[PDB]
Design a protein around this ligand. Structure first.
Ligand SMILES: *C/C=C(C)/C=C/C=C(C)/C=C/C1=C(C)CCCC1(C)C
Ligand SMILES: CCCCCCCCCCCCCCCCCCCC
Ligand SMILES: CCCCCCCCCCCCCCCCCCCC
Ligand SMILES: CCCCCCCCCCCCCCCCCCCC
Ligand SMILES: CCCCCCCCCCCCCCCCCCCC
Ligand SMILES: CCCCCCCCCCCCCCCCCCCC
Ligand SMILES: CCCCCCCCCCCCCCCCCCCC
Ligand SMILES: CCCCCCCCCCCCCCCCCCCC
Ligand SMILES: CCCCCCCCCCCCCCCCCCCC
Ligand code: NA
Length: 270
């Protein structure tokens, strides 16, 4: 009965501890994460005049997303280093009873805030054809909120009840597939009535969206992708999970935002 270690990170940190490499790599990847958001924030502020007025809500939403992600990923980065402390006799980092313990709340809150804005912002760059703005918006927001809420419920049970962790994750995946379906419709309608250069950027946005958003359930399942007591059921699964989350964050937020800005610029060229 391991009482101190909630989530898989605390469980590993309370039982086997983290190697110096695992601890430092995770710290550095999380720091790179918030550093890139700060850089993106300055980018989306400074380039806002490069797009026509009618598209600027997309730049605005990118910047607000950068603020939320910078703040919350900074908090998560400090939560990592504060939750695990070095033991000299073993030579590894263990869960620190005097710390606050690692907490996925920061990242999940960031998702709850950012998912609706990221889905919303494309609607200020492309034009729909036969779909209604309000209908697409409401579907994005409802399914986006439900995907994050049900995923957050599942993640509590990650250590204590693997069955609940997977079932809630499956429910969350149902809302995710709904979002993918709606976004593909948005991309297709967005391609109608624009230049071939604009259509090519939208093609790339779809691939970037599909890959980067699918990385999140992949990192959710990461500790179990090689089975209980498998190679990933260890600090290596923690490292891979946090690496994939950070890649996903930079791609789904920053790169996505840059591509939408590039689309908005191209649309003014006709
Ligand atoms: C920058 C924030 C982004 C775009 C967050 C997106 C998060 C999701 C696509 C995560 C969805 C999940 C599942 C599909 C199943 C497992 C639980 C989640 C919440 C990780
Ligand atoms: C110790 C972390 C310091 C990293 C710097 C964060 C900002 C990097 C450049 C962003 C602009
Ligand atoms: C042309 C678009 C390339 C701009 C790069 C954006 C850099 C954002 C800072 C992370
Ligand atoms: C007008 C364009 C201004 C230059 C935009 C690049 C800003 C990148 C700063 C990111 C750190
Ligand atoms: C903390 C509540 C977050 C709800 C998401 C609201 C963010 C803007 C959505 C429009
Ligand atoms: C409604 C969704 C609830 C799903 C809960 C699954 C619980 C499985 C636990 C089995 C012990
Ligand atoms: C890590 C996410 C990378 C997504 C692939 C982006 C490719 C878009 C252009 C091809
Ligand atoms: C480590 C997470 C593995 C997810 C692979 C991402 C590629 C998904 C592309 C669409 C399916
Ligand atoms: C560390 C990785 C930081 C990535 C910064 C994002 C830059 C995105 C460039 C995409 C520009 C595409 C123009 C066609
Ligand atoms: Na520490």
């Amino acid at each position: 009965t391991q009482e101190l270690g909630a989530n898989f990170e605390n469980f590993i940190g309370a039982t086997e501890g983290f190697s110096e490499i695992a601890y430092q790599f995770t710290s550095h990847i999380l720091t790179l994460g918030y550093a890139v958001m700060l850089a993106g924030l300055l980018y989306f502020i400074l380039t806002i005049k490069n797009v026509d007025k009618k598209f600027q809500m997309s730049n605005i939403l990118s910047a607000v997303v950068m603020v939320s992600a910078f703040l919350l990923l900074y908090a998560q980065a400090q939560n990592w280093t504060s939750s695990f402390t070095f033991n000299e006799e073993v030579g590894r980092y263990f869960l620190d009873p005097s710390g606050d313990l690692f907490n996925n709340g920061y990242r999940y809150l960031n998702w709850l805030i950012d998912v609706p804005m990221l889905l919303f912002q494309i609607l200020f760059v492309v034009s729909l054809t036969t779909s209604k703005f309000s209908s697409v918006r409401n579907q994005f927001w409802f399914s986006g909120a439900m995907m994050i809420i049900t995923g957050f419920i599942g993640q509590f049970y990650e250590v204590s009840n693997l069955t609940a962790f997977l079932v809630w994750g499956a429910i969350s995946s149902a809302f995710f597939f709904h979002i993918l379906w709606v976004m593909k419709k948005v991309i297709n309608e967005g391609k109608e009535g624009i230049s071939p250069a604009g259509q090519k950027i939208l093609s790339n946005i779809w691939i970037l969206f599909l890959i980067s958003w699918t990385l999140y359930p992949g990192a959710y399942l990461m500790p179990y992708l090689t089975g209980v007591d498998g190679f990933l059921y260890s600090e290596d699964g923690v490292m891979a999970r946090q690496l994939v989350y950070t890649i996903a964050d930079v791609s789904s937020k920053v790169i996505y935002g840059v591509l939408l800005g590039n689309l908005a610029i191209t649309l003014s060229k006709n």
